[PDB]
Amino acid sequence: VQLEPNITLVLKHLASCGAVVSAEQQAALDHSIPIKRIEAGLRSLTLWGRLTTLNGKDYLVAEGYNVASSKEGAAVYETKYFYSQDGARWSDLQPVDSETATRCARIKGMLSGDPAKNYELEEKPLVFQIPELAVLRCRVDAIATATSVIPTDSTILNAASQVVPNRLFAGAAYPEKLESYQHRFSLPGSGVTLSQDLRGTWAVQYDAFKGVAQVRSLLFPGYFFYYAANELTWGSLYVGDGLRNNDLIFML
Amino acid sequence: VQLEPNITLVLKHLASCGAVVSAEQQAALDHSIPIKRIEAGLRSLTLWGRLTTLNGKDYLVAEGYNVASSKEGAAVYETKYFYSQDGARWSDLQPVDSETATRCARIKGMLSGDPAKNYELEEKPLVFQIPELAVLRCRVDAIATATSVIPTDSTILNAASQVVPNRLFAGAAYPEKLESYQHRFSLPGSGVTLSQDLRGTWAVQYDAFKGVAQVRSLLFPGYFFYYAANELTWGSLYVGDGLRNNDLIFML
Amino acid sequence: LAANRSTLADKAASTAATVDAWAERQAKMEAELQGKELEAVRRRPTFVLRE
Amino acid sequence: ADVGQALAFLQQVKTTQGASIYEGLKAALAKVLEDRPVNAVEALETSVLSTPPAAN
């Protein structure tokens, strides 16, 4: 049972799904992730995804946290996000207010690739200027609250009521069924899995000979998750512009 | 804690040590290892190494087994070996008698690369003809009984007195010391580690910032082992002609 | 703890003992079979001549 | 002299999921000492006095 997703295995298994990174960025990540993880005091830090931009400088986004705790029936991870445009130097991706969350939710299209740009919105005519990093952080928040996939019963609650890896996890009995996976923020033993999601928003392809399942999000096309059952590893990645697929009812 | 070494991580970590495989052979392995593992009924099957030949068709050697048991104070693995010269089709590497083991031990030089060749030896003048695959099997057996490195206390004994992965293994406390590693055939809790080997036959380089230790054999130059402590993975590989280094006393 | 490890070693010894016992039984039965067959192959002339 | 009294008391009371609380603790300690686990204090509730839901 893994303790943390491995970026090498993620990039190896999800390359068929087109979720790839540049070679220079791959090396740069191999160096930069440990540095930032140590100098931020975090226990976990991984590559969350890669958002494409109009000028060719895609945003790499990394997500880290220290400990996850059960609060109000949800497994809350106090996560912290960082962004980068070369894979070597990570900057903070600061949270956004709730009022601005709606405005950035109204902004669509592929991001510009210039962290200093700000878009404009008009309301009753009061104009707001929303920084691009705000739009980025909210798209990341939406995609994160939508997917955040882990296997079912891979976590467990400890005496201090904290969510820790279940080191005696044996694996998913039926890896080709959506019941084997769940959201990260669902408490262990709560029985809520991906099958409770809106029917038709997930696809699962399972290679029963090699034992590798791929779970693709259809609501957010670009989110891929993999689960290897013979080695008991798993991990996910987002690659794409970050916009939700609203025409899903017409495409199924 | 891993359950079985991953060839991708092995080739990634031991590439700096020159332990590399061709690109075509890498893809071919990615397909061929599961096929052979299933159709042989084995629980584990990994790439053991790669022996260079005089005609450019290096022998890839794979090692598999089903279960390891404690017999007579040794953790015996009923291993089975396969060879290949393209990475796609695996043939058997059959054991060799004890009498022929001495003769093939007397044969030196880089292998020919022609599985149908046989060398000649002369004794009191009785001439023996030793097939090349016999020499290959003997060299693999020697290198295997010499190194076969795993971390210390990574295995454990179960109720049926079988050697199984210790899924609660926390990691080596001091990864830069030879006490953290042991031979595979040493029973758990026996206290025999690599520090009991002949002093000077192992080298250890530990990158304390990334947490990756590399253990190189100096007696069989070409055997490399890696241990990553932040992700708790490990694995080894042999690359070379298979001959022992007898001049070690003059080279240290 | 010491008692449990002793018990485990004992049980493994028991299993090895059963394997050895069955091997012994097979060896003995094959020996008896060969003996019977040789006795039979010896008395063939006395059979085809007398009885 | 209260030690023997307490020992009889503990070997007397039965576990909810067993018997002889004394012997339950003894088996727990023997299991912890058999393989000294990572974060033994935390492993008391997650591996020995219980069983994780997808263990086998």
UniProtKB/Swiss-Prot annotation, chain C:
Disulfide bonds: none annotated. Transmembrane segments: none annotated. It is found in: Cytoplasm, Cytoskeleton, Flagellum axoneme. Protein 3 is one of the 5 radial spoke proteins that are phosphorylated. It comes from the Eukaryota. Belongs to the flagellar radial spoke RSP3 family. Interacts with FAP91. Protein 3 may attach the radial spoke to the outer doublet microtubule or is required to form a stable spoke structure. This is Flagellar radial spoke protein 3. It comes from Chlamydomonas reinhardtii (Chlamydomonas smithii). The chain holds residues 311 to 361 of 516 of the full protein.
UniProtKB/Swiss-Prot annotation, chain D:
It is found in: Cytoplasm, Cytoskeleton, Flagellum axoneme. Probably methylated by PRMT1. It comes from the Eukaryota. Disulfide bonds: none annotated. Coiled coil: none annotated. Flagellar radial spokes contribute to the regulation of dynein arm activity and thus the pattern of flagellar bending. They consist of a thin stalk, which is attached to the a subfiber of the outer doublet microtubule, and a bulbous head, which is attached to the stalk and appears to interact with the projections from the central pair of microtubules. The radial spoke head is made of five different polypeptides (RSP1, RSP4, RSP6, RSP9, and RSP10). Belongs to the flagellar radial spoke RSP4/6 family. This is Flagellar radial spoke protein 6. It comes from Chlamydomonas reinhardtii. The lineage of its organism: Eukaryota, Viridiplantae, Chlorophyta, core chlorophytes, Chlorophyceae. The gene is RSP6.
